[model samples]
Target: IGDEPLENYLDTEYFGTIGIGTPAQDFTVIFDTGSSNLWVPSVYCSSLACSDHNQFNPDDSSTFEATSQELSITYGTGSMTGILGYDTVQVGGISDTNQIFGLSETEPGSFLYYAPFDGILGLAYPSISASGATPVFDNLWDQGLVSQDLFSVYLSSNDDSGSVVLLGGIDSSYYTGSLNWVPVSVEGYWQITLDSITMDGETIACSGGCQAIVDTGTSLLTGPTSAIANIQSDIGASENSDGEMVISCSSIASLPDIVFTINGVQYPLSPSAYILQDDDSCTSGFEGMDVPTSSGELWILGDVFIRQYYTVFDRANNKVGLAPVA
Candidate 1:
């Protein structure tokens, strides 16, 4: 397994082209880290989301094997209900045989209907996989398709391409310096302990510490609205006529870099990197949302934060590595 180029869309979500079955039905998918279970819309689905994108047809694949089990995956924004199946799933140049995946029969809501990609291929731990399906990465390790049991992601900013998800090994040149690693606090979702959130020598959010998820599936740097509002205000973000949170495009230059301390290592996110600009309009990259954790609300580090750093997911030691992007 090696480098797989990802198309950067919405400047937040990135995805790559993949193949399934023998004849190779090409489909674009988000290599999601938030959930497990690789699924694609199938002919069995009649939903609007399924109709707009490419669908999987098992009848055409020579290696397709039907199963009796069913699968369902719910994300931060949407959910999908489908059936289980096994087939040859091709990722980059790596062809994993008998890979367990789902075929979507129903995808509720319009959240996915607007998305251009066909489906999602989860990169999280198998422990959270629906129907206890072994993840695609697990199959790659078992089948000796990957040299190492890790994958690295580089989300290039502002470009339609240049972003890549390198499987099996790390390309050391991608990072500016040595990779700083943080031990996984939880075995699921690349969860780690976030030390604090500071700006200009003051701790604004996550004063003590909290669990943070390095989720590539999501687009914004999300947290509880209670704390998110504090950050939004501190950065001079204000509500617009539509009651939408926005920032003055000119103020982005005068803003301070919000530092996120994880495992005692401080990673600063610049205002230019966090602020999303679309011509004359600008919006805050931080969003109001929360995921319940054992201790408290979980903070999510999405594309808004990832685009500034090169992230490495090490399943071998259950740790994550981060360094400034080159």
Candidate 2:
């Protein structure tokens, strides 16, 4: 198994180092499963975000081959436009040749400027990729580097330590007990059906049913505004002037656990996991995002949930396996 070390970004994002080109120019990138395109800021980019980042220079690499394929990607908050190129990509000491990736010349917003990582490495299916470019993970599988077509994520709450992404196999030492496998409900994103959400043993969030995206890129747990509003009321959380949901730090222990039922299994998020504390102040890790989906509304289980579980994404079986951390 090839294990890549992950670094936490102010307890907000988790990213790891990856190398590109013949001599292997290394850059830190966030592994996003929600999207399917690998992109890094190029030397040609003049955007403010690229100034402090590690820019990729094709001229510096002898094996770089320019491609005419243009690429454009729009995220929920920002967008990027660039051209494509082929190069040797390496991760966790494993190398893949002729890998297609983007060299961004325009990163028009501040979305990437403040990020700790230099680029994004998408791990989703190729169907969601722009211009049909193969993802880095697919190349790993195609080149026979892995025994299984799967990857596991172990996120740590500790600052700047004890986190990783298992590129080819699961680490038995990272998790406890058996894994509960749930089938992937959709093709594009790591979409799964959420049976229900409850507080204090009562179903309060997603009363009927909902679809959830297990996004490693996002930092907090997000749901529809209505759902989050209900949760805020239950926990007596109020939105501060900074637009952050603030709760009394002392009352955290009094709050009940928030349970998410996925694939008929109950996974609970205790008050300690859902709330962020800093001295006398506290903030809710649960936020609101009103995005419409085919399955009514979509919810995002970000680092808040992944930190408590070791997640395994299996491509061959089209399933997601979850287990408690040891």
Candidate 3:
């Protein structure tokens, strides 16, 4: 992928072990079912934030190697500095050989970046750079390690144990019951319109709710003020704590299953979906928040929503699907 970096897998805390400054270790990466291309943070930088995260230090690691390519990442929210290289990444029961990953050469500038995770492993269907991009799934497919033609991703944002990043086929072991499937409209940027958001089967209130563009690039789940308030209130949230329009963490008891209706199909958000773990000692929540802009029209389903269901993206057929895992 040209532009997009690989979505890095993190621990239950959503921290990266390979890309940033951390050493290579097996992790359950949140391989995005939304975007394509896999990039991790590299090892080397002058920022204190780099040490805070488990950055990959090529000099410290035994299995470390490098490539001549250079990479710089700038997201809609923040930016990162890193180098493009190959690492032996292990996901689930599979290990890819000489996989191309981004290693951050410096610290992250984003508010959310932490020491536990150095960078992200991009998992969208289309590679970041459309022309020269190579999807991680394609790399796995080339190895004949995957089972089916279909690629599915299952994630949970709130779980302290973190969620899963399933590759090749769905790991039936991780899911509990039947799969709830939703048809994806093959439109611009893998867009999907959400009909309504319900908590524990009860419909939440909203003023001008909008559709969600399933995005792997975005790390946070952002939405309108009224809609976000409704969802948070349903989950027992009382008010916006951060002053930035986000909800407080004190009210979160447990994450309720948030049902997302799209074309009659219901995709439920996990109970742990609302949990947001920060560096602070006080507990935090991850419910959608009001947009900083007065006219923001999108209700993004970020890693928070993805961790709840098994999402399948068929790039070949140009369609997407959602299945709620047990």
Q: Which stretches of candidate 3 lie over 4 Å from their true place?
A: 1-37, 54-68, 76-78, 110-115, 127-133, 154-162, 173-178, 186-190, 197-210, 215-221, 225-259, 267-296, 313-321
lDDT of 2 by residue, 1-326 (tens): 78888998767889999999867899999889888899999998999988979999999888999988899998886689899999998886777788899999998887788878888899888978988889988988998887889999989884649898888898889898899999988888899989999987799878778899899988889999988989889988898897777999989878889999998999999888898777768888988999796666789988989889899999999899999887
Model 1 agreement with the true structure over 234-300: per-residue lDDT tens digits: 9877888888888888888789899999989999999988899887888999998967866578889
| C-alpha RMSD by candidate, in order | 1.0, 1.2, 6.6
Local accuracy of candidate 3 as per-residue lDDT tens digits, 38-125? 5544346656655554445567656657767766655554466667666666655466666666666664564535434445556554
lDDT of model 2 at position 228: 90
Comparing candidate 1 with candidate 3, which one achieves the higher TM-score? 1
Query: Between 2 and 3, whose lDDT is larger?
Result: 2
* Candidate 2: RMSD to truth: 1.2
Error of 2 at 237 (Å): 1.5
Clashing pairs in 1: none
Better of 1 and 2 by lDDT: 1
Candidate 1 residues lying further than 4 Å off, grouped into runs, are none
Rank candidates by TM-score, best first: 1, 2, 3
How accurate locally is residue 304 in candidate 2, as Cα lDDT from 0 to 100? Answer: 89
